[PDB]
Amino acid sequence: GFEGGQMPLYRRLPKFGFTSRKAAITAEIRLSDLAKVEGGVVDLNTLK
Amino acid sequence: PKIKTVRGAAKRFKKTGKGGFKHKHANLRHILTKKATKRKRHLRPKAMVSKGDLGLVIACLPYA
Amino acid sequence: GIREKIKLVSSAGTGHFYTTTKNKRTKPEKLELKKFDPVVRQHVIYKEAK
Amino acid sequence: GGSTRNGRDSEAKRLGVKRFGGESVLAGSIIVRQRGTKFHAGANVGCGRDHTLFAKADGKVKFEVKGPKNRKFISIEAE
RNA sequence: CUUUAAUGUUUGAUGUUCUAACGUUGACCCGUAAUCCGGGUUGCGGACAGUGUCUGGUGGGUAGUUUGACUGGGGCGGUCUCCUCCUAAAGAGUAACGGAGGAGCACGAAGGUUGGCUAAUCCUGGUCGGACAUCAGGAGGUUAGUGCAAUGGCAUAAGCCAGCUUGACUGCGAGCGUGACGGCGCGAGCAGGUGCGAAAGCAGGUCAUAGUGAUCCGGUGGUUCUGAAUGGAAGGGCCAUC
RNA sequence: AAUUCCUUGUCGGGUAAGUUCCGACCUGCACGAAUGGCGUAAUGAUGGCCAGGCUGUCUCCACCCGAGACUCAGUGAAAUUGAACUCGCUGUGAAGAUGCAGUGUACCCGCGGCAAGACGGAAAGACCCCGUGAACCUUUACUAUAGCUUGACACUGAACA
RNA sequence: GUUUAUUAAAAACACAGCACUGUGCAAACACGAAAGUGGACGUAUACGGUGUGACGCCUGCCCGGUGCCGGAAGGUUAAU
RNA sequence: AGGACCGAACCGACUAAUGUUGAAAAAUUAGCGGAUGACUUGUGGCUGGGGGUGAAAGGCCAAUCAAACCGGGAGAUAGCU
RNA sequence: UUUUGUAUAAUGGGUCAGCGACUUAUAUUCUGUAGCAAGGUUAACCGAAUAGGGGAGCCGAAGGGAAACCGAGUCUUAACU
């Protein structure tokens, strides 16, 4: 990041300082999967 | 050993679908009682990291 | 400056306000002016210091 | 002393020369005061409080002799 | 409850007494016909001193560390950012401790507008009277003025003034000139809420160019955007300004 | 003057001449009375000056003597060494050119003695300046700290006002 | 009398002495956090710290600064 | 009687001299200064490396010194030759 | 070897022999090639092979947004332009 003066690369931009805290536990499942309905009904229990 | 992420950079940039990085722009955090209306409106638009410096940001955020 | 600042409140009951450097050292009679309020979109007096 | 400083750039820019533009905008010059040398006349328009002419047209620039108050101006080309 | 007194009773300030913590580098006794030690007998000091924890001073005695770059070589001098002409080659950038000079703040007004208006300087003439000095007439002219140095537009005045107005605008933007970037500078045009005006139109502060620059923690008020097992709240962000 | 820049000041003493010395004058860039101010017996392998003495210091060296040197027989190093069949003068010139350009001189090779140089030898100059190197010296630069010192609390409490 | 041994032997350094000052003995103080030891087994005519340096004749001005001693009320001011 | 007179040893190190890949990692010669004194010195012990010991020169500490010698951190670090 | 520069009054070589420096572990990015492909790939271990078992993990196929949240859409936002 060092450019010679001018403040290094990243420190020019202010922080965002705030995150979702759920963006790494939200989960995605594709519509082409789970076609047998986990033996009856797809629930957090049968996914678990 | 494995290379590290620059934590002071990860607090400042967010990745895009096309592999670029977003930032909220600078110069909007001080002396707004002297900075002109038109100047504040030119700093308020949100932006991304440009091609001349982007190659260094991906080298600071290697696992992003 | 030594001329100081004055902070005036909106006559719309909004928390958003107006601040200016209006000098009293030659012209001391109070500032009490109309401006556009950006929270109600009206043209209202800004009055009374602090 | 001994002369001091002598400042950088003194930037001044000139666009209103030959058949300029032809796409969406035609231009004058950045010279802090402008009203008749590279300015508009008649139905032509493109200048405000900053004294840089930028007229919003696909017409190329054209040069011609004289106009109002005997000033030079600049004109647009039909095609 | 007030005035009173005594009782029980927690805890400070200051001084006084006692003996029982502590002390003995007081006496003498024994291990030990030992100098250090331990305990005793016996006195005297005495809740101090001592020893520790927290705490205010004092402490180059000792110790860690900082104290720039420019310059036809340093010092002395002048320089570091912004801003202006000439030199600088009829596209365009431009050197020199080359020729030469400024800014570091102000203005509710000089801001927005419909209308109305138009110098300087030189000369002639002055009054009770001038340390300075009146309003006319004659000459003259993008020679005055623009908040401020400097230059150039300028009467369509962008110069000053009357009426109203405060747009010294909110969400934006065909986008654009400049620079390697940070950064600066300009804006068609759309809509929100309006102002002047017969209306168009203009107003996105001032005629154009200096008066201030980032990231960080923090001030202030707003906020179901968030908030950490569940529900608040501290904390985080967002918006507005300091 | 153990102190005074212009300045080698002035006069008396003095020398052939004294920026010397001694004394006087105050005509000392900020000498000045406990770091004293000034004299001063004694001490000096003692600075600045004089006289008296004595001289190879000098005029200027002359001779005489040993031990090196010289020469020979044996023992036998180091710095240095890209390479050498490297002589004048005039001129070019990293400018202060053996070797280039112009033009001389020299059959070929040793030895004693000597410094004109080879920007000779001799330790990656020692001043100056430069390194976001380091060490130390200072202090009312910053920040600690050994030591000294204040209050409170506890070890350590019964009684009194 | 001492000294930069190996470019300085001096006008510097040392000294009877002179001055300023600390110290009541479990002295002041040192090194060690202490264990001890030295001062000293001495006791203000003794010991420690510092400066000054025979002797003679004398010795003006200053408390703004920096440190100490005493005065002790009050101020700035910690833990509590 | 003597930090008195003079003068060998001995000690000092003021002047002259030789030496410099030395005979010597400052030694050897002559003059000079001291010579019962604050003199000179043999053997042991005590004190040591940010530590000693100094009638002081920031001198000297086993040939090495305003931080010696030996072993480690450590092929330290050096926008530099 | 230094230099814009050198017959060089520049550092510097006595020479022959043997030595004397840029490498790939853990990561990573791009290019090349190969196995597979909206899928690609097992770590440790077991170990019988320098191969066969072992699918906890890793990468990748959707974006827009401080974020809540929405999703082939979505932030800005009056937003309907």
From Swiss-Prot, chain A:
Domain of life: Bacteria
Family designation: Belongs to the universal ribosomal protein uL15 family.
Function, in words: This protein binds the 5S rRNA. It is required for the late stages of subunit assembly, and is essential for 5S rRNA assembly onto the ribosome.
Subunit structure comment from the entry: Part of the 50S ribosomal subunit. Contacts the 5S rRNA.
Name of the protein in its database record: Large ribosomal subunit protein uL15
Species this protein is from: Escherichia coli (strain K12)
UniProtKB/Swiss-Prot annotation, chain B:
GO terms for biological process, alphabetical: cytoplasmic translation
Classification via InterPro entries: Ribosomal_bL35, Ribosomal_bL35-like, Ribosomal_bL35_CS, Ribosomal_bL35_sf
Stretch list, region Disordered: 1-21
One of the record's GO cellular component terms: cytoplasm
Compositional bias segments (type: Basic residues): 9-21
Alphabetic keyword roster: Ribonucleoprotein, Ribosomal protein
One Gene Ontology molecular-function label: structural constituent of ribosome
Cited Pfam families: Ribosomal_L35p
Family to which the UniProt record says this protein belongs: Belongs to the bacterial ribosomal protein bL35 family.
Assembly: Part of the 50S ribosomal subunit.
Name listed for the protein in its UniProt record: Large ribosomal subunit protein bL35
Swiss-Prot record, chain C:
Any Gene Ontology CC annotation: cytosolic large ribosomal subunit
InterPro entries: Ribosomal_bL33 (IPR001705), Ribosomal_bL33_CS (IPR018264), Ribosomal_bL33_sf (IPR038584), Ribosomal_zn-bd (IPR011332)
Keywords: Methylation, Ribonucleoprotein, Ribosomal protein, RNA-binding, tRNA-binding
Family annotation (Pfam families): Ribosomal_L33
One GO term (biological process): ribosomal large subunit assembly
GO molecular function, one term: structural constituent of ribosome
Domain of life: Bacteria
Matching NCBIfam families: PRK00595.1 (NF001860), rpmG_bact (TIGR01023)
Subunit (UniProt): Part of the 50S ribosomal subunit. Cross-links to the P and E site tRNAs.
Remarks, miscellaneous: Surface exposed on the 50S subunit.
UniProt similarity note: Belongs to the bacterial ribosomal protein bL33 family.
Protein name: Large ribosomal subunit protein bL33
Native organism: Escherichia coli (strain K12)
From Swiss-Prot, chain D:
GO MF entry, a single one: ribosome binding
Annotated SUPFAM superfamilies: Ribosomal L27 protein-like
A biological-process GO annotation: regulation of cell growth
Stretches the record annotates as Disordered: 1-14
CC terms in the record's Gene Ontology section: cytoplasm; cytosolic large ribosomal subunit
Pfam families hit by this protein: Ribosomal_L27
Signal peptide positions on this chain: none
InterPro entries for the chain: Ribosomal_bL27 (IPR001684), Ribosomal_bL27_CS (IPR018261)
UniProt entry keywords in alphabetical sequence: Ribonucleoprotein, Ribosomal protein, RNA-binding, rRNA-binding, tRNA-binding
Entry superkingdom: Bacteria
Presence of the UniProt keyword Transmembrane helix in the record: no
Family: Belongs to the bacterial ribosomal protein bL27 family.
Known partners and oligomeric status: Part of the 50S ribosomal subunit. Cross-links to the 23S rRNA. Cross-links to the A and P site tRNAs.
Matches recorded under HAMAP family: Ribosomal_bL27
Protein name: Large ribosomal subunit protein bL27
Organism annotation: Escherichia coli (strain K12)
Gene: rpmA
